Amino acid sequence: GLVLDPKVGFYDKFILLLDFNSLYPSIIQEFNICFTTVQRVIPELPDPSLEMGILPREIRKLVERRKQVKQLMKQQDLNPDLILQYDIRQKALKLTANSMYGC
């Protein structure tokens, strides 16, 4: 957990605020961190030649489901209540992906 020293003071111009989209799940997906790949007994990350583990595959499927929902959300002439269900499904996938690291 790295915290950058905040610049205390008052700012006159605009302040643009940017946030990471699921930093830890993206790290897990990128570097293939899993139970079946990391050699443990700070462990060294696996080489890129290895395949996807169970946990990265689960996160990939979680984002695939979000892709499916988002594409189905873009569909026109849909039931007005089904847009709400698509929104709730998107949110649920968001929190599931974000909390994947918490385990």
Binding site: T36, T37, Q39, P46, D47, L50
Partner: protein
């Protein structure tokens, strides 16, 4: 000889590995006296079976395990791999990433398939006595260098069977050599920079490395026998256009006029030497040695030697197409090696059917088994000298 029948392989194979394969010497060589813990239990063998099914990760506890596993099965092809941290037969037991290769003999595989643009007597899939001298071209070029420039003491030359030979370097400091050093070694020993079908593949500067000079001197000794008399690379216009393509264009007319009036390759070669010497004196590029280097120097494969875990043909194996045995070559008598003399598996099995297990002596395999035994005795002497002293 007698024509080898591929359909008879399943029957004769079992007899060959049952009563003729030198199991004792094989186990001795691959165990190295058991100085280290599991140099044989961790060693990987690969077997090509019937139906072309490929099994890669095999391992045996001892010689009896090897005999039992490799006699009830009779593999069609045998290959030797590297030595891993964990037993190859239990590679899925460990975590994914802890199964890696560390030690393997240095393998120099040289083949006639790389002589497509030079050889003019056979096809890319055939050999003859008039071209097998090319193989000897490498034998005194590579084996010398490894012995002289690098100091590799224990080197075994093995007849692959069809279109080339292999070299096993089994020194203790060589087996634990990294892949980058292997790539550097093969790059240093390789001179013909074969590009995308480029006419010029060799280039020499004013300074000639002593390795190049000594290789040229060795090539010079056998150049007249093979590449100038037996091969006749300078006998026709279609033969000599490839030759002059390496020469600069300003000498093409003079060379073609000199070759026009001649009747044999000897005088053509000698006045080509004179003209190239005159051109060098006036201008060097070492034109006379460049054609030697392109036409006789062996071409090595970087991938096979660089790979610390590559699988290469085992000695004393059998070629499915022709049935020749992967016999060791006698380094003392290099130019007297005869591919047509090497016995066939059908031939050796036929002798056995016409007859403490020492049946290999009664067959023609003994002259090569004794060379293998000499190899292992040299290994034992080296181990004793390094350890007990």
């Amino acid at each position: 000889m007698e024509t080898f029948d591929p359909t008879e392989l399943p029957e004769l194979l079992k007899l060959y590995y049952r009563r003729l394969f030198p199991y004792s010497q094989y186990y001795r060589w691959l165990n190295y006296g058991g100085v280290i813990k599991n140099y044989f239990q961790h060693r990987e063998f690969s077997f090509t079976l019937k139906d072309d099914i490929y099994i890669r990760y095999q391992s045996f506890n001892n010689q009896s395990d090897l005999e039992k596993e490799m006699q009830k099965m009779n593999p069609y092809k045998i290959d030797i791999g590297a030595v891993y941290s964990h037993r190859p037969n239990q590679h899925n037991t460990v975590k994914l990433g802890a199964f890696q290769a560390q030690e393997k003999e240095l393998v120099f595989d040289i083949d006639m398939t790389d002589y497509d643009d030079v050889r003019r007597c056979c096809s890319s899939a055939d050999i003859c006595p008039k071209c097998w001298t090319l193989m000897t071209m490498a034998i005194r070029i590579i084996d010398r260098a490894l012995k002289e420039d690098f100091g590799f003491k224990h080197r075994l030359w093995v007849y692959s069977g069809r279109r080339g030979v292999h070299c096993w370097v089994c020194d203790e400091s060589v087996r634990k050599l990294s892949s980058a050093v292997r790539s550097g070694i093969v790059e240093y020993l390789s001179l013909v920079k074969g590009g995308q079908d480029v006419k010029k593949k060799v280039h020499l500067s004013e300074k000639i490395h002593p390795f190049i000079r000594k290789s040229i001197n060795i090539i010079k000794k056998y150049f007249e026998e093979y590449a100038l008399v037996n091969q006749d690379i300078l006998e026709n216009k279609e033969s000599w256009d490839k030759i002059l393509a390496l020469v600069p264009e300003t000498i093409h007319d003079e060379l073609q006029q000199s070759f026009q009036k001649s009747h044999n390759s000897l005088q053509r070669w000698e006045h080509l030497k004179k003209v190239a010497s005159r051109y060098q004196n006036n201008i060097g590029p070492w034109l006379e040695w460049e054609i030697m280097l392109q036409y006789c120097f062996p071409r090595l494969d970087i991938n096979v030697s660089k790979g610390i875990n590559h699988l290469l043909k085992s000695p004393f194996s059998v070629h499915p197409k022709t049935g020749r045995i992967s016999v060791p070559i006698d380094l003392q008598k290099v130019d007297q090696f005869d591919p047509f003399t090497v016995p066939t598996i059908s031939f050796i099995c036929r002798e056995l059917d016409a007859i403490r297990t020492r049946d290999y002596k009664k067959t023609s395999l003994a002259p090569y088994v004794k060379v293998f035994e000499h190899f292992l005795e040299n290994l034992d002497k080296s181990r004793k000298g390094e350890l007990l002293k």
